User: Fold this.
Amino acid sequence: LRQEAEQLKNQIRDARKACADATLSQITNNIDPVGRIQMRTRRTLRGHLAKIYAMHWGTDSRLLVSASQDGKLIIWDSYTTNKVHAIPLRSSWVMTCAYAPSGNYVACGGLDNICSIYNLKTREGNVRVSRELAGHTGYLSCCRFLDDNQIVTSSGDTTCALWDIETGQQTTTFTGHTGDVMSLSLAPDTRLFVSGACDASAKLWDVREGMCRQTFTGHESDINAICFFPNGNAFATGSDDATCRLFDLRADQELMTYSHDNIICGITSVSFSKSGRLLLAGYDDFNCNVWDALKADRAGVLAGHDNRVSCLGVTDDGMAVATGSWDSFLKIW
Amino acid sequence: RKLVEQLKMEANIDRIKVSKAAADLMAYCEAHAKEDPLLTPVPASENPFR
Amino acid sequence: TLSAEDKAAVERSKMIDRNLREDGEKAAREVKLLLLGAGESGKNTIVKQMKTGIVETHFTFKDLHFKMFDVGAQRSERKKWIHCFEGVTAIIFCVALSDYDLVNRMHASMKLFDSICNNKWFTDTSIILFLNKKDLFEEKIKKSPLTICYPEYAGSNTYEEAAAYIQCQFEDLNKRKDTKEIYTHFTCSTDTKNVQFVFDAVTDVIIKNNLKDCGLF
Amino acid sequence: TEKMLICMTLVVITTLTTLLNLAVIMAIGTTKKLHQPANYLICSLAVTDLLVAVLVMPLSIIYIVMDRWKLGYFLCEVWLSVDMTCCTCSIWHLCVIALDRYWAITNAIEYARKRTAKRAALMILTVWTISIFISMPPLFWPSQCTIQHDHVIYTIYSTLGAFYIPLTLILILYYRIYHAAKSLYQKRSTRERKAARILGLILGAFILSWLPFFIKELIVGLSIYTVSSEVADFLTWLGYVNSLINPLLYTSFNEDFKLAFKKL
Ligand SMILES: CC(C)CCC[C@@H](C)[C@H]1CC[C@H]2[C@@H]3CC=C4C[C@@H](O)CC[C@]4(C)[C@H]3CC[C@]12C
Ligand SMILES: CC(C)CCC[C@@H](C)[C@H]1CC[C@H]2[C@@H]3CC=C4C[C@@H](O)CC[C@]4(C)[C@H]3CC[C@]12C
Ligand SMILES: CC(C)CCC[C@@H](C)[C@H]1CC[C@H]2[C@@H]3CC=C4C[C@@H](O)CC[C@]4(C)[C@H]3CC[C@]12C
Ligand SMILES: CC(C)CCC[C@@H](C)[C@H]1CC[C@H]2[C@@H]3CC=C4C[C@@H](O)CC[C@]4(C)[C@H]3CC[C@]12C
Ligand SMILES: CC(C)CCC[C@@H](C)[C@H]1CC[C@H]2[C@@H]3CC=C4C[C@@H](O)CC[C@]4(C)[C@H]3CC[C@]12C
Ligand SMILES: CN1CCN2c3ccccc3Cc3ccccc3[C@H]2C1
Assistant:
């Protein structure tokens, strides 16, 4: 009944407190800090005429995809700034995009409730809408790929989905979130994935079998971004309460909080470095902050965006960090 | 309804010490710090971005 | 320097840049209207008159291309996608007059209007207000007085004075009177002058923006 | 005593003018939001002001300070011709900005299609064409550089073409903009006050800076009266300081320009 839920929640909190023998900050106290981190805008990708809401790097760490209110995705070659592709969108309201791990496909989604998949390597050359995935009843916040055949998707329906592009229909529906899911993060082995929602909670789900493995709370506002640690055993969540947090899958509770008195603005994007030592959180104070993931000390500041830093990404090889903002420019550091 | 069984399944998971998890996190970070271009600035000769 | 493949890549990038510039120039002349209302405000009738998820209605009037975005099917949180419409030319709000005594979508409409026109994204965005179903209101007021929704109302139970009071209260819900203006119109069950009023409000907003570029506003 | 103060005030004026023009040019070029045809016209006006501040004012200062003028009987003609061209091109930019604003507020719907970079480039090209056509005629015909009012027919042609015609055009095009703004205001106090004050600041500056010089030119060129060198120099530099005033009028009243200045 409704009375036993509180008792079991108290039991879980007591178990978590018992497991909290020490703290991450007090263990990484003696390790040498990285110090000031300096980054310069190596590239400035121009060509968008409206606010940019999402991006995704390619597996080869060279090509990337960017989505803006222009109603057109752009596949950029980050090394030489050349626009490889410009895919017009049927619906101009897009707030998520994803670049397939094999590079063949590119997905996007927004207020049309559809994560449309375009085929980039078609025979005729010109990109075409390979699949239109419908079935969500809310604005589409993030749909990330798994392979050329499967995809996971998060919408404002407070539910996530696992679509088979070839068939075109959901194969698993993840329910349990109270608010709108606004973030996804696939595990490096692609076995589990975490989703942060507007109910100030991030749920770790199992892809293959479906049920919610774990739930992590601690935020005081809506969660706008989330990302696994490169090890795959931890993840960082950015919320509207101006604080990032690092939760651990095995420890089943948060380990460190990244916040400051100067920052009072929500986080729009969170990403990790290749080694996981740096945590790059894009703030809607028109900039980004690089935190020491083991110290919570602000190791650097990335400034140069006139408007809110909507999307942030770190390459697979960790060579560069690309930030896309509402001033319609991408910047590669 | 389904919430009680879902939360029971959540509560019946295995647990680990926070110290061990933090130690593993530090071990991974210090093992892969050498392969992190962002942490240690790579020379511009090997940097594909100029 | 650049090889044949590199030169072809640069040529493709330049052609794509040309296409993007042409598309942006084409789309910068379009007037963006964000249609909002209550559950039974009557926005569907208005859309039918002039012409899944968000519904885009494209129409043309006097060489102006209007795109109207209806987000009535979005039952999610409003603050998580409202900023997407930060750059819309105008917000077409619809209020059903006849729903003033129905148990209380009139109060819900007032609250949602207050939340919309005072939103931080729409500080400088004008609202075109429509008071739909006034023909049914004129006959509903006779049997049911307006005092049910607004106890403070004073005067005769005349549809003209009641409509004036409702309008005045909607412009009283505004707190940015020095920046934005609310254009109020009654549908009157015809489309010609309805689209004419929308066009007039849009032209007024455009002239205001042109005067503000020079600082004269 | 007087000479040092005069030199200091002239040099600070001619350096403030060039810094202001450079600031306007850099603000327009750097900011991606400020890439509009009207901002292109303002940038052209700024570069014309820069030209008249770095090619005309320095030569005027050495004439004023070092009593006489010693740079040859050839470079005097070049300086006078470039001075005509620059100080007429500034006025004609002030006129075409008025044309652009009149078309933008009056025919707002139609002029949006026509507001292309090609239109602004054509406007600036015809401004420079007019400026050249009011500077070249006197070429087909020391120790001092005295203006030669030798041919009366050119005196009326130069003074009407450069100032009085743009004067009437600016007056008409801003009176019409004032009525256009009034029609908007009346159909729905402080807004009318601001609209009157900004137009007054734009018009009265252009009057008080240039009109005395051209009225004395009209007097002298018709052999009516005679004016001393000091008064002529004072009115000449009163005309020059419009190069200083113009960026203040045409950038400080725009929100985008103020934001770009704050960013810089
Ligand atoms: C000092 C030397 C270099 C002379 C400077 C004067 C001329 C050449 C300068 C002054 C203002 C400049 C313009 C300022 C802004 C822009 C818009 C930009 O999108 C392309 C370049 C362009 C169009 C510049 C071209 C060069 C320009 C016209
Ligand atoms: C004769 C010279 C010295 C006059 C002063 C420079 C003129 C030619 C320059 C200054 C600012 C310039 C314009 C600024 C911006 C643009 C928009 C761009 O998309 C095409 C070029 C264009 C239209 C420029 C070329 C012409 C322009 C008006
Ligand atoms: C191409 C331009 C920018 C070069 C510099 C121009 C200006 C700053 C220079 C050129 C010649 C200079 C003048 C040369 C000689 C004198 C006489 C001296 O008793 C006082 C200073 C004064 C009056 C100088 C003032 C500054 C001056 C006017
Ligand atoms: C060299 C001198 C003497 C003459 C130069 C030509 C003058 C008279 C011409 C050149 C361009 C002309 C303008 C071109 C377009 C317009 C717009 C419209 O409102 C009609 C008048 C007006 C404003 C014209 C007025 C006269 C004008 C300014
Ligand atoms: C700075 C503003 C007013 C623009 C005018 C600048 C020049 C032309 C002005 C500024 C200072 C002025 C001088 C100030 C004082 C005197 C002394 C007086 O017995 C004769 C005129 C004379 C010598 C003035 C001549 C004109 C002058 C040199
Ligand atoms: C102050 N300086 C600029 C203003 N002026 C103008 C401008 C337009 C038409 C005629 C004249 C009068 C003249 C005649 C001979 C040389 C130089 C001019 C210049 C002198």
Observations:
- Strands of chain C lie at 31-37, 55-61, 64-70, 90-96, 126-132, 182-186.
